[PDB]
Write a protein that binds this ligand. Structure first.
Ligand SMILES: O=c1ccc2c([nH]1)CCC[C@H]2NCCCCCCCCCCNc1c2c(nc3ccccc13)CCCC2
Ligand SMILES: O=c1ccc2c([nH]1)CCC[C@H]2NCCCCCCCCCCNc1c2c(nc3ccccc13)CCCC2
Ligand SMILES: *[C@@H]1O[C@H](CO)[C@@H](O)[C@H](O)[C@H]1NC(C)=O
Ligand SMILES: *[C@@H]1O[C@H](CO)[C@@H](O)[C@H](O)[C@H]1NC(C)=O
Ligand SMILES: *[C@@H]1O[C@H](CO)[C@@H](O)[C@H](O)[C@H]1NC(C)=O
Ligand SMILES: *[C@@H]1O[C@H](CO)[C@@H](O)[C@H](O)[C@H]1NC(C)=O
Lengths: 528, 528
């Protein structure tokens, strides 16, 4: 049977699903690790023990325990990101969509969800892999990994909560794909890992980590990169946050063992209830438990690894959206709200910059403020709002990505860069938010091909070329079919806009602002 | 003309090639069998029909259809093993390097490539025979043979895909050398067949097979022997895999004729795409289509043939490398990777032993684990990594070879044993891999004599003594020129280390571990 597959872990039985008036097989909820519960909470993942009998992979698995967004109850704009299954610490599963008839040995794509390392689910409707698997004939995999304290509580030195375990969950699912995807018709020598936001940062982290490099072929990074300011912390900062988490739950803090034991007796929701209290600064776009530069998963600092070419050399395709920062301001900065145009006073602009570059002294805050203010029109509310939006996006996503791409390209085997600036016709978020962080995903997963979702015909056409670019790149290392997306090179630095207009090629994506964020401000904060 | 040679099959025209500031003649691509295409796929080879006119033997022939390594695109360490010519089922050719001026009747050496019986090419740069032909004045021949399903699909009972045809390809090239090498100045009564890994196992198979014995004089086996656990299967297992291959390609499986007809209509790459899906166990160092103990090429089981002295009696020179197993763990076991020191956890060690002795029950896995674990330091990552490396190498190469050599020596006419443990100064593979499977070949073929390859002067000197040992042994049955490599005897069991230090003689190569693999574990698995 087409729905029965024999893996090295045991037999698994899928389910047939309809897609654009046709059908494909889906194997939902395949376990790849032992449930990280009880004493295994905070520990490195262990491989799933093989099972006898047939594993029912006909329904989505649980989502990992995470903070749930309740800012706009029932608003589809925000709820489409929340867990749509019951949450459970027993959440280490992967999902596979396989073309029908079963391919023999085709291109594989593995999706790694984002969510700032504190949330995310592989089961969301925008991540439904049937459209891409079907339209491009690829075997599409989506994995899961522990987030929040469960995935990233870090007490360096302890083997009980070493940190980075959520990245080790990702690695284990990739080990499983490498080892078993051939039975589903996937080619283990042609797997592309791709992800957005924290998922894109994760993809970049597996490209850097010696221990993950051999498990995949190529990579796609969407609005995220490994060196993002919110994507990692030192082992000392990770320790300080773990201790502060324990302090919030009245834990004995005399030894790592005492702290970890206490944290393990707490119900999941007790950890999530105080998670946000450990941030060191009043800040925006900062998450509590994220990867740690531990000397193992990351052998040295991310920057020296980038400088010395200490990373997987292959092809990469990556890019950013026009208004990466808007939703972080909506959710966390004074003066911004969902139902108003959010014109910002100079006072709110300034408290907004303080929130956006939490680690800066007064001189640094003045350098950012000057760089983003039009002094011939300083009380223009629209300009203040847009300037703040760009500050958040440039500092947190764009400039870190541009720095990663220029460092990568020097040693890599091929780079394709994009700038996604299409505002969807059916967007439910207000206009001031522009092309929002996460909104290129629906085009990557082909949602505009389904009539009921109400996209325009040109949006469907855009979705189809993006999917074909992503799959063609996954298959060959080049998004182009033998109008050209030019290669990004050290010298030329070309990239394309990705929207409904005829392709335009440009150069040096946000160079002006990124020289400020990647060279000047850091020098400024280091001297003062 | 020195480049024109008249053989029993027709005239062939060679090409003059430069070597170490001198020159020799090369006759590349001489056909020895009819192309095994169309309805001849899976069939025994047929002798090449003589041709009129002159055969252009100035360029390398195609390589046989095989799985291609893409784990490290462009890495020279791995690509030096991949086909460097176009692949084609039309691949049955041999290559000859002849000293200049043309010898009258000199020592002949025939190289049989390895590659686990699923890959390999006679045209690789490490197999360039000009250095050895030139430096030692031998006529050097390299043959080819079908690998993968093309060479070893076995449906015992059928004459259409009887199995072992790849070994019959080897035999036919040897028949051709026996019959025609005199015209190239070679002495047909003094031919030494030599090969590495599956090539060394093949050499041992022609020593056992009654039908191949009279076609050569002496033999050299490098890191491989006929009784290796991965080198053969029963006719029942061969049948089960052929049927499973057919099942993977939606073949009618009602009769051998139906299955074979279906398999013959498939394009080469369709067979290679699913080849790895027929292995019975999750395993490492196991290949899908290998020789079958069929009652014809091998009259009875390999072990009873060894026990009863049913094999060619002559002299043999053979040996092993220090870390035969490392690359198989890199490529197939969790926790190992090219760019890290690969320190293994106890968990990865254990899943590694399961993968390495696929055919063992739990008690057997416990016996291997206990034998290779230092219990005073069980979490030592380096020790776990090295222990696993030794398990793979001892079980797959060393102990099978030691068993073959002790059985052979009882009836043979002279044995010389070696242990190659020199790690090359210019090795591109990480340190943890040690003296890798296949890395003595470059010394046997004299690559260190070419300055541009960057070896040390002592490496050049080592290469020169190995080449002179191999050629002197091929010419006389003794590697020594009238410091001595002592004869391996039943009583003394002496062998030498082969490296840049002064020769040291030792005894009983890995006896302790090999008594475990050759006597205890098999008894254990047979009783339980
Ligand atoms: O001092 C502090 C700092 C923060 C906070 C507190 N105290 C107290 C508790 C509330 C917490 N605030 C809730 C913030 C949660 C994280 C900020 C981001 C808003 C929620 C994002 C959820 N999901 C989205 C995701 C993506 N795009 C989106 C776009 C629009 C709206 C929501 C999106 C892209 C993929 C990742 C998830
Ligand atoms: O369940 C399974 C088991 C295996 C596999 C799959 N599924 C799915 C497909 C991939 C296949 N894995 C690829 C394995 C290929 C064979 C394992 C060995 C690695 C490739 C060896 C290629 N060439 C080499 C050869 C030699 N020495 C070498 C040394 C270092 C690196 C490569 C070397 C010595 C001569 C023979 C070839
Ligand atoms: C798999 O689970 C679903 C719902 O949990 C159920 O409808 C279906 O019958 C199950 N299949 C089998 C054979 O257990
Ligand atoms: C990628 O590598 C191959 C060989 O290693 C080389 O021929 C090709 O030019 C490289 N491409 C780029 C964009 O560096
Ligand atoms: C032999 O073939 C090579 C290339 O295919 C060519 O350069 C050479 O001229 C050929 N020799 C003859 C006489 O056909
Ligand atoms: C090899 O055989 C010859 C004669 O058959 C004999 O004189 C010689 O001693 C033998 N050598 C060995 C090592 O058995």
């Amino acid at each position: 049977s087409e729905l029965l597959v024999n893996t090295k872990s045991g037999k698994v039985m899928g389910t047939r699903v309809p897609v654009l008036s046709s059908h494909i097989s889906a194997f939902l909820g395949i376990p790849f690790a032992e449930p990280p519960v009880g004493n295994m909470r905070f520990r490195r993942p262990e491989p799933k023990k093989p099972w006898s009998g047939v594993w029912n992979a006909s329904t989505y698995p649980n989502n990992c325990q995470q903070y749930v967004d309740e800012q706009f109850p029932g608003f589809s704009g925000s709820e489409m990101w929340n867990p749509n299954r019951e949450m459970s610490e027993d959440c280490l599963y992967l999902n596979i969509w396989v073309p029908s008839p079963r391919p023999k040995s085709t291109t594989v794509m593995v999706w790694i969800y984002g969510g700032g390392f504190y949330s995310g689910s592989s089961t969301l409707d925008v991540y439904n892999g049937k459209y891409l698997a079907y339209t491009e004939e690829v075997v599409l995999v989506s994995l899961s990994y522990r987030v929040g304290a469960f995935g990233f509580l870090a007490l360096h030195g302890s083997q009980e909560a070493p940190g980075n375990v959520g990245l080790l969950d990702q690695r284990m699912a990739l080990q499983w794909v490498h080892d078993n995807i051939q039975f589903f018709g996937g080619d283990p020598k042609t797997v592309t890992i791709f992800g957005e936001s924290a998922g894109g940062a994760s993809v970049g982290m597996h490209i850097l980590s010696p221990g993950s490099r051999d498990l995949f072929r190529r990579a796609i990074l969407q609005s995220g990169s490994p060196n993002c300011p919110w994507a990692s912390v030192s082992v000392a900062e990770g320790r300080r946050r773990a201790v502060e988490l324990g302090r919030n739950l009245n834990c004995n803090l005399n030894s790592d063992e005492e702290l970890i034991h206490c944290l393990r007796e707490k119900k999941p929701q007790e950890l999530i209830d105080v998670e946000w209290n450990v941030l060191p600064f009043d800040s925006i776009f900062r998450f509590s438990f994220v990867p740690v530069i531990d000397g193992e998963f990351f052998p040295t600092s991310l920057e020296s690894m980038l400088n010395s070419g200490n990373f997987k050399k292959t092809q990469i395709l990556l890019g950013v959206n026009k208004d990466e920062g808007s939703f972080f301001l909506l959710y966390g900065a004074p003066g911004f709200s969902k139902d108003s145009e959010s014109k910002i006073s100079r006072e709110d602009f300034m408290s907004g910059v303080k929130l956006s570059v939490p680690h800066a002294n007064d001189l640094g805050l003045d350098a950012v403020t000057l760089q983003y203010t039009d002094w011939m029109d300083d009380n223009n509310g629209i300009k203040n709002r847009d300037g703040l939006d760009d500050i958040v996006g440039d500092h947190n996503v764009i400039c870190p990505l541009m720095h990663f791409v220029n460092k990568y390209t020097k040693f890599g085997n091929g780079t394709y860069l994009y700038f996604f600036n299409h505002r969807a016709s059916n967007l439910v978020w207000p206009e001031w938010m522009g092309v929002i962080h996460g909104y290129e995903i629906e085009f990557v997963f082909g949602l505009p091909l389904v009539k009921e979702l109400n996209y325009t015909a040109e949006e469907e056409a855009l979705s189809r070329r993006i999917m074909h670019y992503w799959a063609t790149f996954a298959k060959t290392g080049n998004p182009n079919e033998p109008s050209k997306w030019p290669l990004f090179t050290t010298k030329e630095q070309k990239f394309i806009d990705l929207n409904t207009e005829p392709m335009k090629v440009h150069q040096r994506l946000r160079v002006q602002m990124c020289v400020f964020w990647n060279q000047f401000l850091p020098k400024l904060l280091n001297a003062t």
